[PDB]
Amino acid sequence: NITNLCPFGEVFNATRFASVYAWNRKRISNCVADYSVLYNSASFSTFKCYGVSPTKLNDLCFTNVYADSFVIRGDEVRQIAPGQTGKIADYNYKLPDDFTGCVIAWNSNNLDSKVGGNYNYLYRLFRKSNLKPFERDISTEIYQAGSTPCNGVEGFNCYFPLQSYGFQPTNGVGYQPYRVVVLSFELAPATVCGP
């Protein structure tokens, strides 16, 4: 019955999104969420919902929601879905098998690219073992790809575990930056639900 708008404005319209390997997470609570404005925006390239169908989100009440945001390459978007495998779904950001939420993505080629090449976006490439769902790894220790221990210094068979996307305004549509926001619902006194 409380009447205050959810801060959906700042999440989607933030000036800076973090790298895929250090994705942000935000709690939204004690507010009424109007999901109609998002859907009829036509500014989103992809709006896919698992376990819950849109156009009914204005009903239903949730315990608490989650907003995960980052930026990745345009082609790699299809890896953000349950049961998918790849570099992103193994070493960077993995979704559980029982996901109940929606995935929103839209092209951002005119904000995240620079003339000289943007090297401020990175992604993890090597890891000893795959990730568990919703687990984040931030460390930057040197990966040991061979029999000879590296002892914390890089060299032959001692690779740095992070690599740069290198976005540019002239890249193909498959290699352009895309912004992604993942909403997770959990279905306790419900606090967030629309009018």
Partner: single-chain antibody
């Protein structure tokens, strides 16, 4: 690991496509293949690192693909200025270049080289590579030395860098008689060879490598030729 350039030589016309091929002796788990284009009389230029990602100020005609033991480069629409040579470089447990294909048709950081160009046989050779626009003791860079001769192609000599202290590496062929010395006071690095032989006649370049950019030779030097003769 040995890289073999599959197409020998191609002759095309303006407008259509071109297709290259690079083959690895065994699997490259590091996946750090890079493609370089060299015009005559000029230092090589970087095109693609990571086998797919574009470099700085490069049009969209060039495309890269491949994985495992094979790789390919594709040119969408040729231009009369594409009279050049194209190489194929890898990194991992070893650093090796490729033979390369000759194709014929019908900026904020600078490296400057200095040193003598002629030396008496059985003497010492000294070269220096001054840096403008960066600090030689950077945390995320390495400084290399490359040399080229027509009989052997492009050859890797040695490298130096600094993470907590100074670290050096050298190629097995030249281990016994090579030295690399940095100097932070005047921000340079120099190469020394105590003994020289007639076959050493070659053209030398100094190059910078950034670890987050696929270990690709980003910025090259002017390069100078050295001839060993009486």
């Amino acid at each position: 690991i040995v890289l073999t350039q599959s197409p020998g030589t191609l002759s095309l016309s303006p407008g259509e496509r071109a297709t290259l091929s690079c083959r690895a002796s065994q699997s490259v788990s590091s996946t750090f293949l890079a493609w370089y284009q060299q015009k005559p009389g000029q230092a090589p230029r970087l095109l693609i690192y990571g086998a797919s990602y574009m470099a700085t100020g490069i049009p969209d005609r060039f495309s890269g693909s491949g994985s495992g033991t094979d790789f390919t480069l594709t040119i969408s629409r040729l231009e009369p200025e594409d009279f050049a040579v194209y190489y194929c470089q890898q990194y991992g447990s070893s650093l090796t270049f490729g033979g390369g294909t000759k194709l014929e048709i019908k900026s904020q950081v600078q490296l400057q080289q200095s040193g003598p160009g002629l030396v008496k046989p059985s003497q010492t050779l000294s070269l220096t590579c001054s840096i403008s626009g960066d600090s030689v003791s950077s945390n995320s860079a390495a400084w290399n030395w490359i040399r080229q001769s027509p009989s052997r192609g492009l050859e890797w000599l040695g490298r130096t860098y600094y993470r907590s202290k100074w670290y050096n590496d050298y190629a097995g062929t030249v281990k016994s008689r090579i030295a690399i010395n940095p100097d932070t006071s005047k921000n340079q690095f120099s190469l020394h060879l105590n003994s020289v032989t007639p076959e050493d006649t070659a053209v030398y370049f100094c190059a910078r490598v950034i670890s987050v950019a696929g270990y690709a030779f980003d910025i090259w030097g002017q390069g100078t030729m050295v001839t060993v003769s009486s």
